[PDB]
Design a protein around this ligand. Sequence first.
Ligand SMILES: CC(C)CCC[C@@H](C)[C@H]1CC[C@H]2[C@@H]3CC=C4C[C@@H](O)CC[C@]4(C)[C@H]3CC[C@]12C
Ligand SMILES: CC(C)CCC[C@@H](C)[C@H]1CC[C@H]2[C@@H]3CC=C4C[C@@H](O)CC[C@]4(C)[C@H]3CC[C@]12C
Ligand SMILES: CC(C)CCC[C@@H](C)[C@H]1CC[C@H]2[C@@H]3CC=C4C[C@@H](O)CC[C@]4(C)[C@H]3CC[C@]12C
Ligand SMILES: Nc1nc(NCCc2ccc(O)cc2)nc2nc(-c3ccco3)nn12
Ligand SMILES: CCCCCCCC/C=C/CCCCCCCC(=O)O
Ligand SMILES: CCCCCCCC/C=C\CCCCCCCC(=O)O
Ligand SMILES: CCCCCCCC/C=C\CCCCCCCC(=O)O
Ligand code: NA
Length: 390
Amino acid sequence: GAPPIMGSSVYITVELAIAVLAILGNVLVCWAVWLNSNLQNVTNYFVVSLAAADIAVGVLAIPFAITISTGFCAACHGCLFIACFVLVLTQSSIFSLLAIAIDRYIAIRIPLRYNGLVTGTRAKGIIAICWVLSFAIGLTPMLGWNNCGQPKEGKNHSQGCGEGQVACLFEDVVPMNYMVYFNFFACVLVPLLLMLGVYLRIFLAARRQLADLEDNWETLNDNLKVIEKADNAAQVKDALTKMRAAALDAQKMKDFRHGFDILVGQIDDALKLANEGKVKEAQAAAEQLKTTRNAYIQKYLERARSTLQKEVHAAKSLAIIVGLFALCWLPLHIINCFTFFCPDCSHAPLWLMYLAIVLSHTNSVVNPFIYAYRIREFRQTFRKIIRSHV
Ligand SMILES: CC(C)CCC[C@@H](C)[C@H]1CC[C@H]2[C@@H]3CC=C4C[C@@H](O)CC[C@]4(C)[C@H]3CC[C@]12C
Ligand SMILES: CC(C)CCC[C@@H](C)[C@H]1CC[C@H]2[C@@H]3CC=C4C[C@@H](O)CC[C@]4(C)[C@H]3CC[C@]12C
Ligand SMILES: CC(C)CCC[C@@H](C)[C@H]1CC[C@H]2[C@@H]3CC=C4C[C@@H](O)CC[C@]4(C)[C@H]3CC[C@]12C
Ligand SMILES: Nc1nc(NCCc2ccc(O)cc2)nc2nc(-c3ccco3)nn12
Ligand SMILES: CCCCCCCC/C=C/CCCCCCCC(=O)O
Ligand SMILES: CCCCCCCC/C=C\CCCCCCCC(=O)O
Ligand SMILES: CCCCCCCC/C=C\CCCCCCCC(=O)O
Ligand code: NA
C-alpha cells in the first residue's frame, strides 16, 4: 500500500488549484456586475448569489474538504459542519439556478408585466430566503440525522480520539440515506428536473412566439394578394376583416406603435370602401398598406424576432450552466447511490471518490467561463476590468 500522504498530496494540491480558480473567476463575475450597469438586472442578482456560493466553495468548502480527507479526530457535531457546509453552498446554487430559470420564463411569457413582477427588491428577498433554506437543508444532519450516536469506535480507538470525538470522515458521520433520498433525490435531482422543465417551457414559449410572429406576417402578405386578385368588394372585405384582426392582435417603440396605427387605420379606410361597393378603390387603398409594411411593420417583425432569438441564446447559455452543474455533481451523487443501494457492491475506490469530489468542486470554476464565452456583456466587461486593472 503506497504511503497515503502521496496520493493526498496530489489531492490537496489539486484542491488548492481549484480554489484559486473558483475565487478568481467568480470574484471577476461579481466585480463585473457591480461595475457594469448593463449587468445590474434581476437575473444577474441570482448570478451574483450563484457567484457568491462558488467563491465560498474555494474559501470554505474546499479547505473543509482537505480537512475531512485526513480523518482527523474531531467532535462529531463539529465534524458534521465541516462535512455538510458544502451541501449548503450547493443547495444555494440550486435555488439560484432554479430562480434564474423561472426568471427567464417570466421574461418570455409576460415581458410586459415582468418589470412590475420581478423587481430587485423581491429578488433580494428571495435570495435571502433561499440561503436560510439552504443552510437548513444542508445542515439537516446537524439537527439529528447523523451517525454521531453510532460511532465507529474501532476507527476512533485507532487514531486516539478523545471522549465524544470521531475520526472525521464524511461517510462515517453523514448517513447515506440522507445523502441519497434527502439531499440528492429530493433537494438536488427534483429541482434539476424542474429546471429542465422550465427551460423546455422557455424554448417552447419562444418557438411558439417566433411561429406566431411569422404566422401574422405571412397573413399580412398572403391575404394582401387576395385583395390584389379580388373580383368583388365583398371578397376584398372578407380579406380586410382578417388583417384588422391580425393587426390588432399583433399590436399587443414610439414608431412601431406609430406604424400600427397607420396600418389599422389604412385597413379601416379600405374596409369602408369595400363596404360601399368600391372594389377597385378599396384595392388601391389596400396597396397603400405596403408602404406601411416596409417602413414600419417590417422593422417591428426584425426587432421582435431579434429580441426572441436573443432570449433563446441567453436561455441556452444559462441552461449550459445547469447542465455543467449536473455533469459535475451527478458522479458524486451516483456513487452515493451505489454505496447505499448496493451493499453487495464493493465500495467505489478511494481514487475515484476523490476524483468525483474534485470534479464537483471544479463546477465552481466553470461558470465565469461560460459567461465570458456566451454573454457578450460579461465578456466585454471582463476584458475591460482586466485590461484596466490586472
Ligand atoms: C466566518 C468563517 C469564514 C470563519 C471560519 C470558521 C470555521 C473554519 C470554523 C467554525 C466552526 C469550526 C469547527 C467547530 C468544531 C470543531 C470540532 C473540533 O473537535 C475540531 C474542529 C472543528 C471541526 C471546528 C473547525 C473550524 C470551524 C469549521
Ligand atoms: C453524470 C455522468 C458524467 C455519468 C457519471 C456516471 C459515473 C459516476 C458511473 C459510471 C460507472 C459507475 C461505476 C460502475 C461500477 C462500479 C463498481 C461498484 O462496485 C462501485 C461503484 C462503481 C465504481 C460505479 C461508480 C459510478 C460510475 C463511475
Ligand atoms: C439525472 C438523471 C441521470 C437521473 C439520475 C438517475 C440515477 C439516480 C440512477 C442512474 C444509475 C442508477 C444506479 C444503477 C445501478 C444500481 C445498482 C443496483 O444494485 C442498485 C441501484 C443502482 C445503484 C442505481 C441507483 C440509481 C441510479 C444512480
Ligand atoms: N460519499 C462521499 N464521501 C466523501 N468523502 C469521503 C471519501 C471516502 C469514502 C470512503 C472511504 O472508505 C474513505 C473516504 N465526500 C462526499 N461528498 C458527497 C457529496 C457531496 C454532495 C453530494 O454528495 N458524497 N461524499
Ligand atoms: C425573508 C427573510 C427571513 C427569513 C426567511 C425564512 C425562510 C423560511 C420560511 C419560508 C417561507 C417564506 C418566508 C417569507 C417571510 C416574509 C414574508 C413577507 O414579509 O412578505
Ligand atoms: C482566504 C483563505 C482561504 C483558506 C486559507 C487556508 C487554506 C489552507 C488549506 C486547507 C486547510 C487544511 C487544514 C489541515 C487539515 C487538518 C490537519 C489534521 O488535523 O491532520
Ligand atoms: C447567508 C446566511 C443565511 C442565514 C444563516 C442562518 C440560518 C441558519 C439556518 C438553520 C441552521 C440549522 C443548523 C443548526 C445546527 C447547529 C450546530 C449544532 O448542531 O451544534
Ligand atoms: Na463542507
